[PDB]
Amino acid sequence: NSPLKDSLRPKLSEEQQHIIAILLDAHHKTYDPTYADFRDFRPPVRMSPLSMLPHLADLVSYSIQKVIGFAKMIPGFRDLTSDDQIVLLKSSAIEVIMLLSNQSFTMDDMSWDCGSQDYKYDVTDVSKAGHTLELIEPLIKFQVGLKKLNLHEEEHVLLMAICIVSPDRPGVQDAKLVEAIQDRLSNTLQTYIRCRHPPPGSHQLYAKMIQKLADLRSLNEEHSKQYRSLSFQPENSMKLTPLVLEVFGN
């Protein structure tokens, strides 16, 4: 075989395997499947208007901190300017949180089940945090469609990293460098799927995963809209956390 023909044969390079290893570890170190810290949040109240906002605000604020910790471990991420790291996290946080949550989501009853009845969230809980079907229905649909992909954890953490390092985010300065970082991750994912995800599950899997990124942009836009409306009321904004205000807007 010619060097060309042989070079066309897909192979997970040592560097690409290394990238996957780092992202798996990063996820391990920032997602607690025991959910032990939820005790620390303001208590969930299920009955009054916005009764679940304090608890879900605390959950989300906690999860933003975890997203930041994961982002810092993405190969290339820290070579970005402080400003670009900030804009990428401000814009992606809600999306990565939606991705992370797929781990607790269950299609048994279409809820996020975090180990106990107190920490099991359904569409009614989300509405009681100030959100409407315009966000919630598509969010459930997203969770269902993602679950249907039955991603390998490898693919799950690659997707989160690709989500974070997106060059077309608002406020991005060195889009060229963000794009180079993302491309290394995207190629790693494409090659992982070809070499490690057996058919039929692999069918158009990359394209399906990129469609989920597009879905996340739409969810982000609608969340931002409802969040601005929600936070416009000072009495609501009072119930949020300082980190949520800084990241999602004030």
């Binding site: 930041i68 402080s82 790291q85 900030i86 401000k90 980190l243 800084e246």
Partner: peptide, 11 residues
Amino acid sequence: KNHPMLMNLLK
């Protein structure tokens, strides 16, 4: 725009 807490968590 100043994101002190984000900036500090990123250090």
